Each structure stands twice: as structure tokens, then as C-alpha cells.
Write a protein that binds this ligand. Structure first.
Ligand SMILES: *[C@@H]1O[C@H](CO)[C@@H](O[C@@H]2O[C@H](CO)[C@@H](O[C@@H]3O[C@H](CO[C@H]4O[C@H](CO)[C@@H](O)[C@H](O)[C@@H]4O)[C@@H](O)[C@H](O[C@H]4O[C@H](CO)[C@@H](O)[C@H](O)[C@@H]4O)[C@@H]3O)[C@H](O)[C@H]2NC(C)=O)[C@H](O)[C@H]1NC(C)=O
Ligand SMILES: *[C@@H]1O[C@H](CO)[C@@H](O[C@@H]2O[C@H](CO)[C@@H](O[C@@H]3O[C@H](CO[C@H]4O[C@H](CO)[C@@H](O)[C@H](O)[C@@H]4O)[C@@H](O)[C@H](O[C@H]4O[C@H](CO)[C@@H](O)[C@H](O)[C@@H]4O)[C@@H]3O)[C@H](O)[C@H]2NC(C)=O)[C@H](O)[C@H]1NC(C)=O
Ligand SMILES: *[C@@H]1O[C@H](CO)[C@@H](O[C@@H]2O[C@H](CO)[C@@H](O[C@@H]3O[C@H](CO)[C@@H](O)[C@H](O)[C@@H]3O)[C@H](O)[C@H]2NC(C)=O)[C@H](O)[C@H]1NC(C)=O
Ligand SMILES: *[C@@H]1O[C@H](CO)[C@@H](O[C@@H]2O[C@H](CO)[C@@H](O)[C@H](O)[C@H]2NC(C)=O)[C@H](O)[C@H]1NC(C)=O
Ligand SMILES: *[C@@H]1O[C@H](CO)[C@@H](O[C@@H]2O[C@H](CO)[C@@H](O)[C@H](O)[C@H]2NC(C)=O)[C@H](O)[C@H]1NC(C)=O
Ligand SMILES: *[C@@H]1O[C@H](CO)[C@@H](O[C@@H]2O[C@H](CO)[C@@H](O)[C@H](O)[C@H]2NC(C)=O)[C@H](O)[C@H]1NC(C)=O
Ligand SMILES: *[C@@H]1O[C@H](CO)[C@@H](O)[C@H](O)[C@H]1NC(C)=O
Ligand SMILES: *[C@@H]1O[C@H](CO)[C@@H](O)[C@H](O)[C@H]1NC(C)=O
Lengths: 81, 372, 372, 81, 372, 81
């Protein structure tokens, strides 16, 4: 293992030691990002801004949906095997 | 149980395959999506828990609902209708910019992408403390887990019709790896005549029995009760650097330092290890200066010779001797001098390679020369 | 046309000379500056297009005007005059810090400096979506251009008297380089006895006919219709690394991996390439475990031997054979083991240089000794 | 070119290829950063804050303007030579 | 005067020992801490100086007080009690996150840690300009000092009873190092036959009489009056690269460049050094093309041969000759071709070491070979 | 020193030189971060939010105070030795 005697003779020392801990995942929860705000109490003062907001989101969300679909079409039950 | 149609998929990374199968178990069923869509279209709060009995609790986060509920709605009777739209329109565009930053073309593979909860902070409304509380994530290890970026989310469902994204969030559990110790190393300079040198060693190393490996501290947090790493931090160390750490000093590389180096003395095991040829070492008890002979490279100060030593204007009391008196330079095998900069490396590597071609004909006639 | 007074200028780089001459074409004439100054001291909006009839359109952006128009002005009749100043003063000081951060002494070489539109976000009021719209910048390539930082601004005029900066901004055009293909590479570990190894190859490589070169992905965005790069991503590859990619396996370097390597199998052409000596390989249909022979390093699984295979608890269905059966280790010439870390490279390079230095006498006597 | 046969014998495969596009710029627009806000309706309630804001701006603007003039004085019409 | 008890401390670095002792003279004495706590209780301002007669001024900063006085207090008559708490709670949690970011477990070794004033901006209320004004930090060197991040803070006292943190902050003064010149280097490509090469030199170098060293510009700010560095920027240069800069051209390494290189001409001492074999060089005064001999690698254009030259589409006027006109390639000894990429280095280093392992028996047979 | 003549024959030139300045510190000031806001004029509308804020802070401040106490208790007057 580490030879601390020779290491000190060229000016190298240990100033600390500690245990090593890693992470493992057991349970998962669902976190949903509701992208569309509730604007009912804002009457109709935000129609144009909301409508612009949805258009910008579609150009981002649609590519992600296609990637998910392109993977879940290749998932088949093991009963067919 | 599910199977992957590899022929249809064609090509896939192991991370893609593992994450893609995990979608089967971590997705909401087609009916749960329909009920989720109804539940989302009746909430008016920034954070809300959706209790669909028979299925795990769903946490809904709206990134601009605090602004609407706290600022816009109360000011409804005093502002004009056009100004309300302008104020919300500013927040929506900034929120879209953050959504584009998270989930846009820079997000390379959405399927196997892992996003830390900190990176989602703006998408969740700016702060994650209330979310961590509502998720039930708490305990004595949360600070070590949180600062290691250990709470990761996966994209499981993206709904373009009702504009929401479902994420799979998990709180890790910590486990100690048996027989692994992470060592922190520090060094001080030493003089060989008029030149000040430094040994080149890793900042952190890890040991397991007789095995020595490198330690990557980038993903780790050094807590009082152990180092908490969100990734695998151990990676192999070259055999030559392992010879160095096993006590072969000739295997250890060394580099010159600048004239204003900061590591010229260290306190170790109650003793002071100092390069007394490059700093001022004075014995406070007698007032006699501690001089380092040119045939010695370091000074090992203990109470048997100086109960109180002053170095660099700092007065220090030391304990009993636990390091030997310094040995002569001729009893230390020193390693090669190196320059660590990438351009210094390339200049020296290119010179060394060039010398190898000039001897290529010589090196091929090896067995012929040695046998004869 | 204009001529640079290079004798009077003395020293300048190609970037400085080019941007200096381009400053002649991009600067407004003094008459426009006088009309622009009068136009600027008439507007009260955060974004406004100023159209000087007969000349190109100029966009004017005020970075704190939304706050004044939306927050401060409506509050005039119910707040004290002193609080209004404190609220504006808070924003002005925060705005100044951004201007200092962007245009201060950290900005080296203002003449030839190119500043991305995203870095201008705070100076433009916090968001850039409205600016891109008013600039007319839109289309199907906007995301690829924007995420790769392809919209650059350049300083052309600085007005100390009326406190404004004129910028020159351009919306780029995408052009395909004919005959250039960017290949993404991935690897799988293999076992030699009980040691797990990994071949060291670049993540991305580019080809153009016979030529193979390195590829820098830092400025690129991988769009579904092709990678979009805002700089030159192609740069030379060393001749020895090119021999690796051209089929010389002895030219490819290999490195040991950690005990938790996560690239032990891959799906390629409907076939599974797995290190079955390092992971558990079982044929799902027959239930027998697929053993990796010690004289082999990899396993190439196709439907002719196992139509459905489980690899790490993931069941995979594979297609017809596109990869031959694994060959023996004695038919594969393997390359040299290496360590890629900075300190490991220095320690090993220092050892090699010292070995060359010690044998310098004999290597510099080769021609005579081989002619004895 | 790339010998995919030998690369797979040491566990190296290609998982995708794409075309290479670069950028060239033809037309240029002008974007002016108006640093001084319109404060007419604030009714002289921000005089000190504006003046201090201007004072800080001058310390950043002058060095850049000096650099631009230093290069511009070296640009001369080609008809003279 | 104080002594450190190294026997009780056990182990400590020089930075820890130095910062530990310096804490003695920088801590407000136990009497002032009691007086400070009473003074902090009576304030209601974001920034305020504590004037306790006979002792140095202390500046107290409250990070959310501006929001309370400006935004919440004026609206107490129009909002509800619950909404007031909801708004402040949002700001408190965001402020806590920044405190956790600054002073949490990521903060390794709080005693020896130095935090720049810019990093504390959010903790101080989002802006440092007013704090610097009331600290008295001003003058003609502020811009260079601040951008180099030279205004550092250290934790002095932490009170968990009244929840405050005391920091020690210092305004540095600038000192020139006599005899040190920082040189900026720039390169131009040359051609050998059809290949375009580039010498590999550092961006910045520094000299001190005879000695040359590397320069690290990471902490520096190149101001018009000189280079202001907040750390030690000088670090040693390898002997071989020192020979390169002292006039040995074969010691300098060189790399092939991409096909779209942007450094093919430079203006230096009123003359243009241009490749002219990868870019078009044309003499304006006569309309002729400046052709480069294949036995030459560069062109040195001066008014004695071409008063006005058009290069790369830019027309430049040049002065009298101040560079000798180019010499032939046979009169220049060039250095080794190298590749600077990490993977290219590892591939070539691994190959070079392997040839050394394969030739061991010959290398330790040198003394038999050389003597006999 | 630097041989500019040989450097120009391989395409290397100097494009600027400057003097070198470092930083030194002699006087220090005290800057205190007051973590507890003054909320008297807010009546008692923030009791729970403030209390929850204090609880989060102690989990950060206590480990820092303990480190300072450890170093200070090892500092002793020079006359004692
Ligand atoms: C795809 O992958 C395969 C499998 O590796 C490659 O085949 C290898 O090709 C390399 C490079 O051509 C071969 O290496 C060279 O082999 C030559 C033939 O050696 C035979 O004869 C010797 C007699 O001593 C036998 O010991 C040996 O087993 C062989 O049967 C040698 O001439 C070469 O050695 C020379 O190397 C250098 C020359 O630069 C100098 O040191 C000396 O001159 C020395 O003699 C060299 O070893 C290798 O043998 C092949 N592997 C095999 C056959 O298993 C394919 O080339 C590759 N595909 C493509 C398209 O390249
Ligand atoms: C600016 O740049 C110039 C050139 O760019 C430098 O000039 C070099 O100076 C060095 C040092 O003096 C020269 O190196 C020596 O050159 C001598 C000339 O060699 C003659 O003989 C050989 C054999 O036929 C021919 O190849 C050569 O052309 C000449 O006819 C030799 O005496 C030296 O040989 C040495 O060889 C080995 C080296 O491994 C040693 O062991 C031997 O003992 C012996 O000394 C040596 O080569 C170098 O040649 C010059 N470069 C040239 C001429 O291109 C300037 O020095 C430089 N300025 C600064 C300040 O650096
Ligand atoms: C701790 O450090 C000491 C001091 O360097 C090490 O002793 C050194 O050991 C090496 C190899 O064991 C010796 O080299 C050997 O020399 C003999 C004589 O020719 C030869 O048999 C071998 O081929 C080899 O070259 C070296 O001389 C010796 N150092 C001194 C100063 O004598 C010791 O090994 C280290 N301990 C550990 C556990 O690493
Ligand atoms: C927006 O929020 C409002 C509340 O402001 C939601 O209306 C409530 O819906 C729930 C769900 O069943 C009912 O119990 C309440 O009675 C409703 N409130 C009132 C005042 O009637 C509404 O559903 C939301 N609208 C959306 C999301 O479009
Ligand atoms: C600040 O904005 C005001 C508007 O609030 C500007 O006043 C208008 O300026 C236009 C421009 O010619 C005139 O045609 C309008 O008649 C003005 N309207 C009012 C209500 O005064 C004013 O010019 C701006 N002041 C500046 C920039 O100093
Ligand atoms: C919080 O602020 C209040 C005022 O908002 C402070 O009360 C003032 O305290 C000063 C300091 O002695 C006195 O001069 C004033 O007369 C006080 N004003 C009033 C209206 O009583 C208070 O001290 C601050 N701190 C707290 C309550 O802890
Ligand atoms: C808003 O517009 C919709 C669509 O016509 C309708 O609910 C109604 O007109 C408005 N509702 C309000 C103002 O609450
Ligand atoms: C602000 O002061 C100016 C004098 O500089 C005056 O002309 C103007 O009317 C004032 N604005 C008001 C009173 O709103």
C-alpha cells in the first residue's frame, strides 16, 4: 500500500483520509411540468401572448415526443418470444 | 416483461437500451395520462400533488403561477388590460428561453439524458426547496446528496396537445464501499542547491487492500462522515505512478516551481516539515536560525531540537519527534524532471519521438547485435 | 475602396486588419449619427425600429425601459418621489454591471471581437426573442444557428456624448461541405483473461474521400438534417491515429477501465456485441448461458445462434448475422496500453525522456555501429 | 477510408453519421444599444441615480471609443494612393 | 503575538496555518461582537455602516431588506397578510439557496478560503457597486483590480444565535516587478510544398534579463497601463521550449493546420509577413501577382518592392524594409511535427514507450557496446 | 533574451509587451452579512416563513462555526511559551 515513509522524504504527506460512499436508486416519483398557466382570473388580457407562447413551445416539444415514440415502438411483450 | 426489437431499432448504445426499457416501467399508462390531463386543467397553484389512488402520487409544477397569483391577479383592478398582457408576455418569453435551454437541440439524447434537480430550478419556478419538501426528499444526507448533483430526472412523456412534460425523479440511497479509503495528499518544496523542486502527485488517491487507483473528485462532496460521490470516482492509475506511491522515489516525477511558491512548510503529525533553504526558519526558544545544509533537501523540525519554531513570521509549537532527521541527498533516488503544460509536453514529446525515428534502423537490428 | 496605413499602424493581426477594414463598410456616416442621435432622443419603448428613409433599418433597444414603463410609471401617483429614485437606481446599477461585464477591460481587442446574441441578452432587456423577431431573423434553421451561437454582433460606433453603442449583427447562411461526413464512434470493453480493456478512439471523426480528420463538436449542434457548426470544426489528426482508423489495430491505444464500466455491450446492425466475460449473457429462448471463451475477447450475437438474448436483465431480440463469429486473440494484433490522465502522462513521459537521455551516446552512434 | 471490419474486432462501431454545414454571412443589420432611458414621465425623481449611472458608463465607454478612433485614423481612401 | 499548537492541531497546510494565525488579528474582539449584535438589531437598511467610536468602521449588508422596504412595506395596506408572507417566503428561499451555494458543503476549508467580492454579489443584495462605494474602495486602479477579482473576503466570525457572518475584506495595492516584461506572441502559417504548417509557441511569455518563463493569464487583466494579475502568473518553462524562444528553430514544434486557417498574414514593424502560397498576394502599385518560390516558406513585403499590396481582399500600405527578405528552406532548420490533442498525445506516447520496452536489452548493453 | 530574428523566419512575431503588476494587501475592513431581516413594519405576516428560513440557515452556519472554533482554540498567547 502507500509507503508514507519514502513519500515524506520527498516532501509528500497525507493530510486526511475518508470513506467512499456511492448512490443507488430504489424508488421513483413522477414530476410533471405543467407548461400552460391557469390564466382564468386574468380575463382575456393575455390571448396574444399566450398564443405566441404555445407556438414557441411546439418547436421544442415535438422533436422530443418523436424521440420517445421512436423508442416505445420497439418495445414488445416478452410473450411473443 | 418487455423485449427490445434490436433488428428494428438497428443501432443503440447500452445507455440508450437501458433507459429505453426503463420507460416501460416508469411511464404512466394511457388511462393515467388521460386522467392526468384532466387534473392538470383544474389546478391553479405553482405546486400541487395529484392523488390518483392506485398509482403513485404526481407532483405538478407551474413555472409562472407564482407571478400570476402574487403580482398580476391582485393588481387586476388597478392596471389596464393591455399592460397585464405585456407583463405576462415578458415572463413567458424568459420561461420559454429556459425551456429551450433545457430541452432544445442542445439536449442531445432525450431518452438517456439525466437532468439534475438544480438545472431544473428555473423550470420549476426559480427555487427547488419547496419541491424537495413536497417530494418527501429529506434526511441527514440531503446536503451531501444535493451538492453532489445526485437527484436526477428522466423524461418519460411529452404531451404536445396539452403542453406538459412528465419526469421520473429519484432520491438515491448512500452506501459505503467496503475497504476503500480516499487519501488527500499535500506537498512542500525542497531545494537541490539553488533550485527549488516539487514532487508531482495526485491531489486524491484511493486504496483498496493493496490496490491503488486514481480518484476523480469532480462528482464528489467531502462530508464529515465520508466522501459522497454521485458517479463512480475511482479510475485506474498507471503502473509507474503506482510504483511512486509504493515507495519508489525514482519513479516519482518532479517539477520546478515559481520564485513565489506557497508550499514551503507543512505541519504533519505534530512536526513541521519545511524547506529551510527557501524560507526563514528560526528557533524561537534560543533565537538561533535553523540553517539547512546543501547536502540535505528538507528539514524535519521536532521538539527535541526546537520546542518553538518561527517560519514565515508564524510562531508554532511542535510535539515529539515522529519523523527522522533529514537524510542526505545521496541516499535519495530522485526522479525525472518534467513540465506538465500541454505545449511543453508536445514540444518534448515531439522531440523524443523524432529521436526514435533516427534510431529506427538501429532498434530493428537489436537481436542481431545482441546475439553477436 | 480604402487602404490601411500599415506603416502608421505598425503591428496588427489578420483578424484586426480584416475587422478594421470591415469597420469602414459597417460604420454609419456622420450624417446618420446625427440623425440617429435625434431619433434616439424621441423614443420611449424597449424595442423600436428606426427607419431612415433611403438607408437600412436600425433597431434601438433600451435595457431598463420595460421596468420604467410597466412598473415605475404606473406607480407614480401612489409612491413617494424618493422611493421611485431608489427603485430605478437599483436597476441602473445592475444594468451597469452587465455593461461592465460585457464591454469592460475583460473584453480584449474590441475591434476584432465578436459577441454572440445570447451574451447580449441582459443588455437587450433580459430576453432576445423579440429582438430576433424585429430583426426579421426566422426560418427553419433558426434553432440550429442559435444553439450553435451563430448570430454574432460587432461594435462599430461608441457615442460618449449621447451614451449609445452601435452594433453590426448578421444572420448567417448555412452551406454544406461536399464530400464531408461526420461519424460518431462508440466503444465496447473486452477482456484479456481477467483484465477489462477499452480502445481509445475519438468521439467524432470526419472523412472526405481518403482523408480522415479530427472533429471539434464544441461549436456544433447536431440537428436531424445535419450538424451545424458556427466555427471550423475540422482539424488535423495525427498520422498514427489515422492508421488506427484505417484498419491497423496495433496502432490503436487501449486503456484499463474502472470496475463499474457501463459500456460492456452495444447493439449494431441488429446484432449485439457484448463482453460476455464481464456481463451475464443468457440465451432467452433456450435458457442457456452464453459463455465467452478465454481465448476470445468479444462475443458477436446474432439470430442464427440466439434469436432472443438477455444481457443485463434487459431482453433483446436480434436479427440476422452481420458480424462474423469472434476470432481468437492470436489473430488480433493489439495496441499499447496507455493512461490518458495529465499526471500519468507526465510521469510516463518523464520516464521515457530520461531513458532516451541516458542512452543518447549509443543512439547518436548508430550509423557507425550498423556498418561494422 | 474507415475500416469498420477491424474496428469492430476491438469493440469500436459507428452509431451514426451526418452531413457537415458551416456558416457564411452576407447582409448585416445595425443594432444600437440606447444606454440612457426615457425618464420624462418620472418627473425629476431620479436625477441623482441617472447622473451616477452616467458617471459609471463613461469609465467603460471612453476606452472603447479611443480604440475605434485609433483604427479609423489608419483607414484612408484608395484614390489618394 | 500568538503561537500555534501544532501538537494539538496535528496536521495543517501552510495556507491553513497562515490563515489560522491571521484570524487572530482580524477577529473583532469579544467585546465588539457583543456590541455588534446590538447594533445589527436596530438597523432596517440594506447597507449601513456601524460607527462604534474608537474602532474601525463595519459595513452591515442585509440581502433582502431592499425588497422589504421598497416592495412589501408600501403594499401592506392593499395586500393581505397571507400574500405578504408568500412573497417574502419566495425571496427568503432563493436567498437561502445562494447562502447554501456560497457557504455550504461545496465550500472546502472555510478558514483558508478566499471569496471574491463578485461571488458575494447575490448575498450582498445582487450588486456590489454600493458596497464598494461605502467601503471607500475607489481610484484609478479599480477597473483592473476588480476584473482580476483581487478584492477578496475571508470568514472571520459566525454567530448562530443572531444569524450573521463577519467577513474580512481588503483592497489590494499594485506593485510592479522590476525587470519583468510580458510578451504577446502571434504566429503566421507557412508552406512546405503543398502543406501549411504552424509553429507551436505560447500565447504569452515573460522575461527577466536572461530568464524566460511561461505566463498564466488566467488571473490577469491586460490594462492599457500594464498587466494586473491577482495571482502569481509566472511559472517555469521547460528547457527545450526555452531554446526555441532563444533562437533554436529546430527546438520549436510545428503542426499541420485546418484547410481554412485564419492566420496567413501579419503586419509587423510596418511590414507584412504573409504566406502568399495559401492566400493571393498582389502588388497594387504595378498590378502584378506576388508569387512565392517553392524553396521559400514565407513572404516579407516592404515598400522597397511593393508600396501598396492587396492581400486576401484587403489593400494595405507598407513602410520601409525592417525584415530581411525571405531565405530558402535549406537555410532554416525546422522542428518536429506534433499533435496537441489529448488522444493524439496518448496514442503517440503509447507507441513511443512500447518501442522503448521492446528495446530494453539493447539499451542496458550500451556500456559493453560503447566501450568495446 | 528572445531572438526575434529567428522567430520571424518561422512565422512568429511579437505583437505587444507590457509590465507586470501583482497585488499586496496591508489594511483590512470588516464586512458583516446580516442574515436576519428587519420585519417590524410587516406586522406578523411572515412568522412561519421566517422561522422556516432560520431552520434552513442553522444547517449551514453551525458546521462553519465549529471549524472556526477548532482552529481558534489552538491559538495561544506567545508569552505562555
Ligand atoms: C485488418 O486487421 C488485420 C489483422 O490485424 C490486419 O492484418 C495485419 O496487418 C499488419 C500490417 O500490415 C501485419 O503486420 C505486419 O505483418 C508483416 C507480415 O509478417 C508475417 O511474417 C512474419 C515473419 O517474421 C511473421 O512472424 C508474422 O506472423 C506474419 O505472418 C510484417 O512484415 C510486419 O512486420 C514488420 O513491421 C515493421 C515494418 O514497418 C518492422 O518492424 C519490420 O520490418 C517488421 O518485419 C508487420 O508485423 C499483421 O501481420 C497482420 N495481422 C495478421 C496477419 O494477423 C489487416 O492489415 C487489417 N486490414 C487492413 C486493410 O489493413
Ligand atoms: C538563429 O538561427 C540560426 C540558424 O537558424 C542558428 O545557427 C545555428 O547554430 C548552431 C550552434 O552554433 C549550429 O549547430 C552547430 O552547427 C555546426 C555546423 O555544422 C557544420 O557541419 C555539419 C556536418 O557537415 C553540417 O550539417 C552543417 O551544415 C555545417 O556545415 C556544427 O559544428 C555543430 O555540429 C554539432 O553536431 C552535434 C549536435 O548533435 C554535436 O554533438 C557536435 O559536437 C557538433 O557541435 C552544430 O550542428 C546550427 O547548425 C546553426 N543552424 C544553422 C547553421 O542552420 C543560431 O544559433 C540562432 N541564434 C540563436 C541565438 O540561437
Ligand atoms: C524506500 O526508499 C528507498 C530509498 O530509495 C528504497 O531503496 C532503494 O531501493 C532500490 C530498489 O529496491 C535500490 O535500487 C537497486 O539497487 C541495487 C544495487 O545495484 C540493485 O540490485 C537493483 O537493481 C536496484 O537498482 C536503491 O539503491 C535503493 N536506494 C538507495 C538509496 O540505496 C526502498 O526500496 C524504498 N522502499 C520501498 C518499500 O519502496
Ligand atoms: C383555473 O383555476 C380555477 C380556480 O381559480 C379553477 O376553477 C376551480 O376548479 C375546481 C376544480 O374542480 C373547482 O372545484 C372550483 O370550484 C373552481 N373554482 C371556482 C372559483 O369555481 C379552474 O378549473 C382552472 N381553470 C383552468 C385550468 O382552465
Ligand atoms: C420621452 O418620451 C416621451 C413620450 O412619453 C416623448 O415625447 C413624445 O415625443 C414624440 C417624438 O417626436 C413627440 O412627437 C410627442 O408629441 C411626444 N409626446 C409627449 C406626450 O410629450 C419624448 O420626446 C421623450 N423624451 C426624451 C427622449 O428625452
Ligand atoms: C427594525 O426597524 C425599526 C424601524 O422600522 C427599528 O425601530 C427604530 O429603532 C431605531 C434605533 O434605535 C430608533 O431610533 C427608532 O426610533 C425606531 N423606530 C420606531 C418606529 O420605533 C428597530 O430598531 C429595528 N430592529 C428590530 C425591531 O429588531
Ligand atoms: C374570454 O373569452 C372567452 C372566449 O370568448 C370567453 O370565456 C369570454 O368571452 C371571456 N371570459 C372572461 C372575460 O372571463
Ligand atoms: C423637470 O425639471 C425640468 C428642469 O430641468 C423642468 O423643465 C420639467 O418641467 C420638470 N418636470 C416636471 C415638473 O414634471
Amino acid at each position: 500500500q502507500i509507503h508514507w515513509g519514502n513519500l515524506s522524504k520527498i516532501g509528500v504527506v497525507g493530510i486526511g483520509s475518508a470513506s467512499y460512499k456511492v448512490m443507488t436508486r430504489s424508488s421513483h416519483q413522477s414530476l410533471v411540468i405543467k407548461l400552460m398557466p391557469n390564466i382564468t382570473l386574468l380575463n382575456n388580457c393575455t390571448r396574444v401572448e399566450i398564443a405566441e407562447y404555445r407556438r414557441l413551445l411546439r418547436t421544442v416539444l415535438e422533436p422530443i415526443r418523436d424521440a420517445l415514440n421512436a423508442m416505445t415502438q420497439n418495445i414488445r411483450p416478452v410473450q411473443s418470444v | 416483461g418487455v423485449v427490445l426489437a434490436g433488428a428494428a431499432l438497428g443501432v443503440a448504445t447500452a445507455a440508450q437500451i437501458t433507459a429505453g426499457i426503463a420507460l416501460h416501467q416508469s411511464m404512466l399508462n394511457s388511462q393515467a395520462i388521460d386522467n392526468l390531463r384532466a387534473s392538470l386543467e383544474t389546478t391553479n397553484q405553482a405546486i400541487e400533488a395529484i392523488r390518483q389512488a392506485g398509482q403513485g402520487m404526481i407532483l405538478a409544477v407551474q413555472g409562472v403561477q407564482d407571478y400570476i397569483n402574487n403580482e398580476l391577479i391582485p393588481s387586476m383592478n388597478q392596471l389596464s388590460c393591455d399592460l397585464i398582457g405585456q407583463k405576462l408576455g415578458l415572463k413567458l418569453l424568459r420561461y420559454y428561453t429556459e425551456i429551450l435551454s433545457l430541452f432544445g437541440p442542445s439536449l442531445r439524447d432525450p431518452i438517456s439524458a439525466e437532468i439534475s434537480i438544480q438545472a431544473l430550478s428555473y423550470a420549476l419556478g426559480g427555487d427547488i426547496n419547496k419541491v424537495l419538501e413536497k417530494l418527501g426528499y429529506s434526511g441527514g444526507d440531503l446536503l451531501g446528496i444535493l451538492e453532489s448533483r445526485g437527484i436526477k430526472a428522466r423524461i418519460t412523456h411529452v404531451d404536445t396537445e396539452s403542453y406538459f412534460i412528465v419526469l421520473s425523479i429519484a432520491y438515491p440511497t448512500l452506501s459505503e464501499i467496503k475497504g476503500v479509503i480516499v487519501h488527500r495528499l499535500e506537498g512542500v518544496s525542497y531545494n537541490i542547491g539553488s533550485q527549488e523542486w516539487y514532487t508531482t502527485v495526485p491531489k486524491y488517491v484511493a486504496t483498496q487492500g493493496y490496490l491503488i487507483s486514481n480518484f476523480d473528485e469532480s462528482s464528489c462532496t467531502f462530508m464529515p462522515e465520508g466522501t459522497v460521490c454521485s458517479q463512480n470516482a475511482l479510475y485506474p492509475m498507471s503502473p509507474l505512478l503506482q510504483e511512486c506511491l509504493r515507495g519508489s522515489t525514482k519513479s516519482c516525477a518532479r517539477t520546478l516551481v515559481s520564485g513565489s511558491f506557497g508550499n514551503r512548510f507543512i505541519l504533519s503529525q505534530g512536526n513541521l516539515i519545511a524547506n529551510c533553504a527557501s524560507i526563514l526558519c528560526k528557533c524561537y526558544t534560543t533565537g538561533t536560525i535553523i540553517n539547512q545544509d546543501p547536502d540535505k533537501i528538507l528539514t524535519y523540525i521536532a521538539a527535541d531540537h526546537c520546542p518553538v519554531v518561527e517560519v514565515n513570521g508564524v510562531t508554532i509549537q511542535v510535539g515529539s519527534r515522529r519523523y527522522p532527521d533529514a537524510v542526505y541527498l545521496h541516499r535519495i533516488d530522485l526522479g525525472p524532471p518534467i513540465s506538465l503544460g500541454r505545449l511543453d509536453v508536445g514540444t518534448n514529446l515531439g522531440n523524443a519521438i523524432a529521436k526514435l525515428e533516427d534510431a529506427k534502423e538501429l532498434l530493428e537490428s537489436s537481436d542481431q547485435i545482441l546475439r553477436s
